Amino acid sequence: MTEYKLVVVGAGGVGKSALTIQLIQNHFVDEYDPSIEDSYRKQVVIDGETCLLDILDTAGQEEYSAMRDQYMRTGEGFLCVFAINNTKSFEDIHQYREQIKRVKDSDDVPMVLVGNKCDLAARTVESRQAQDLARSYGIPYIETSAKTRQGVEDAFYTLVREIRQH
Ligand SMILES: Nc1nc2c(ncn2[C@@H]2O[C@H](COP(=O)(O)OP(=O)(O)NP(=O)(O)O)[C@@H](O)[C@H]2O)c(=O)[nH]1
Ligand SMILES: O=[N+]([O-])c1ccc(NNC(=S)Nc2ccc(F)cc2)c([N+](=O)[O-])c1
Ligand SMILES: [Mg+2]
C-alpha cells in the first residue's frame, strides 16, 4: 500500500468538495465538520496494486496561500475540477496549474482535468473548450457530476494513472 496525496483544486464553488466525498462515501455532502482539513483517505486497488488514496480538499476561498505551497510539495498529483456552467472556473484551472508547475518545478506534472456539473442545463464552457485546453497541456479530460454522480470515480481514478505513469 502506498500513500497517494491527491491535491484537489478547482476554484471554490465548482464542486470539488462534493466530487471528493463521492469517491469516499459516495454520498452528497449533507453533514460534515468544517473549520478543518476536509481530507479523506480511502484504500483501493488500481493498476493491480492496492494503495491508499489520501484525498486532500483545501479551501478554494479565504487567505491561506502558505497552506497551498505546502500541499503542492506534499501532494504527488493535482486534480483540476471546474464547472462547465461557470466560465470563471475554467479560468482558475489555468492559473492554478501555473502554481503546480512552479512548486513541482516542471511543466509536465501528474494531474487531471475534470469537468464537474455535467447534468446541469446551462453549460457555458462546452467540452470542446476544455478538451482543447487539456489536450494542449498533455493531460486527460474527464466529465463528472457531483449531483447526478456520473463517472465521479472515473475522474479521480485518472489521477492515480497519471502519477503511476509519471
Ligand atoms: N447542481 C449541482 N450542484 C452542485 C454541484 N456541485 C456542487 N453543487 C452545489 O452548488 C453549491 C456550491 O456551493 P459553494 O459554496 O460554491 O461550495 P462550498 O464552498 O463547498 N459550499 P458547499 O459545500 O455548500 O458547496 C452547493 O450547494 C454545492 O453542493 C454539481 O455538480 N451540480
Ligand atoms: O505554510 N504553512 O502556513 C504551513 C505549512 C505546513 C504546516 N504544517 N505542516 C503540514 S505537513 N501540514 C499539512 C501537511 C499535509 C496535509 F495534508 C495537510 C497539512 C502548517 N501548519 O500550521 O501545521 C502551516
Ligand atoms: Mg462543499
UniProtKB/Swiss-Prot annotation:
PROSITE patterns from the UniProt entry: RAS
Outcome following mutation: Q61K: In NMTC2; somatic mutation; increases transformation of cultured cell lines
Membrane-related topology note: Lipid-anchor
Reactions catalysed, as given in the entry: GTP + H2O = GDP + phosphate + H(+)
Processing and modification events after translation: Palmitoylated by the ZDHHC9-GOLGA7 complex. A continuous cycle of de- and re-palmitoylation regulates rapid exchange between plasma membrane and Golgi. S-nitrosylated; critical for redox regulation. Important for stimulating guanine nucleotide exchange. No structural perturbation on nitrosylation.
GO CC, alphabetical: ciliary basal body; cytoplasm; cytosol; endoplasmic reticulum membrane; glutamatergic synapse; Golgi apparatus; Golgi membrane; GTPase complex
UniProt-annotated location(s): Cell membrane; Golgi apparatus; Golgi apparatus membrane
Keywords: Acetylation, Cell membrane, Cytoplasm, Disease variant, Glycoprotein, Golgi apparatus, GTP-binding, Hydrolase, Isopeptide bond, Lipoprotein, Membrane, Methylation, Nucleotide-binding, Nucleus, Palmitate, Prenylation, Proto-oncogene, S-nitrosylation, Ubl conjugation
Effect seen on changing T144I: GTP-binding activity reduced by factor of 25
Entry binding sites for GTP: 13-18, 29-35, 59-60, 116-119, 145-147
Any coiled-coil regions, as ranges: none
PTM annotation (S-nitrosocysteine): residues: C118
InterPro entries: P-loop_NTPase (IPR027417), Small_GTP-bd (IPR005225), Small_GTPase (IPR001806), Small_GTPase_Ras-type (IPR020849)
Activation/inhibition comment: Alternates between an inactive form bound to GDP and an active form bound to GTP. Activated by a guanine nucleotide-exchange factor (GEF) and inactivated by a GTPase-activating protein (GAP).
Primary localization class, coarse: membrane
The keyword Nucleotide-binding is assigned to this record: yes
Sites carrying sugar chains: S35
Distribution of this protein across tissues and organs: Widely expressed.
Modified residues (N-acetylmethionine): M1
Result after altering D119N: Loss of GTP-binding activity
Disease: Costello syndrome: A rare condition characterized by prenatally increased growth, postnatal growth deficiency, intellectual disability, distinctive facial appearance, cardiovascular abnormalities (typically pulmonic stenosis, hypertrophic cardiomyopathy and/or atrial tachycardia), tumor predisposition, skin and musculoskeletal abnormalities.
Biological function: Involved in the activation of Ras protein signal transduction. Ras proteins bind GDP/GTP and possess intrinsic GTPase activity.
Family membership: Belongs to the small GTPase superfamily. Ras family.
PANTHER family: RAS, DI-RAS, AND RHEB FAMILY MEMBERS OF SMALL GTPASE SUPERFAMILY (PTHR24070)
Protein name in the entry: GTPase HRas
Recorded name of the encoding gene: HRAS
